């Protein structure tokens, strides 16, 4: 599923403030990693990040690439490529509670200040 920035801002209204993340920070990361496409994948040599929230199989979900993964979200990574971002949000909240905003922002400085362009 492909979303617009406004569609997605409405679906994610609830996660705003969760664990200290701001919705526009999220939308910034999403624009750059998926173009708001729930089927996006970003590959690294060892691991892969899936879907809108770019959730890694290194730790967070089960995938044949990384059979040793801790699978902290107790879910197949395939669920992060479907059209239902509900499970993705569940796992992103776990990420926020365990790792925090750094998961998305530590290496995406542009999405940590001057964020007016991400408002609907
Ligand atoms: Ca999903």
Curated annotation (Swiss-Prot):
Q: Which UniProt keywords apply?
A: Calcium, Disulfide bond, Glycoprotein, Lactose biosynthesis, Metal-binding, Milk protein, Secreted, Signal, Zinc
Main location per UniProt? secreted
Q: Where does Ca(2+) 2 bind?
A: 79, 82, 84, 87-88
Q: Which GO terms describe its cellular component?
A: extracellular space; Golgi lumen; Golgi membrane; protein-containing complex
Q: Which residues are glycosylated?
A: 45, 71
Q: Which residues bind Zn(2+)?
A: 49, 116
Name the positions where Ca(2+) 1 binds: 38-39, 81, 83
Disulfide bond listed as a keyword: yes
Q: Where in the cell is it found?
A: Secreted
* GO biological process, alphabetically ordered: apoptotic process; cell-cell signaling; defense response to bacterium; defense response to Gram-negative bacterium; defense response to Gram-positive bacterium; lactose biosynthetic process; signal transduction
Q: List the disulfide bonds.
A: 6-120, 28-111, 61-77, 73-91
- The C-type lysozyme domain, residue ranges: 2-120
Q: Which domain of life is it from?
A: Eukaryota
According to the UniProt entry, its GO molecular function terms are: calcium ion binding; lactose synthase activity; lysozyme activity
**Tissue-level expression:** Mammary gland specific. Secreted in milk.
* Its job: Regulatory subunit of lactose synthase, changes the substrate specificity of galactosyltransferase in the mammary gland making glucose a good acceptor substrate for this enzyme. This enables LS to synthesize lactose, the major carbohydrate component of milk. In other tissues, galactosyltransferase transfers galactose onto the N-acetylglucosamine of the oligosaccharide chains in glycoproteins.
**What subunit structure does UniProt give?**
Lactose synthase (LS) is a heterodimer of a catalytic component, beta1,4-galactosyltransferase (beta4Gal-T1) and a regulatory component, alpha-lactalbumin (LA).
Q: Can you tell me which family this protein belongs to?
A: Belongs to the glycosyl hydrolase 22 family.
What this protein is called in its record is Alpha-lactalbumin
Q: Which organism is it from?
A: Homo sapiens
The gene coding this protein: LALBA
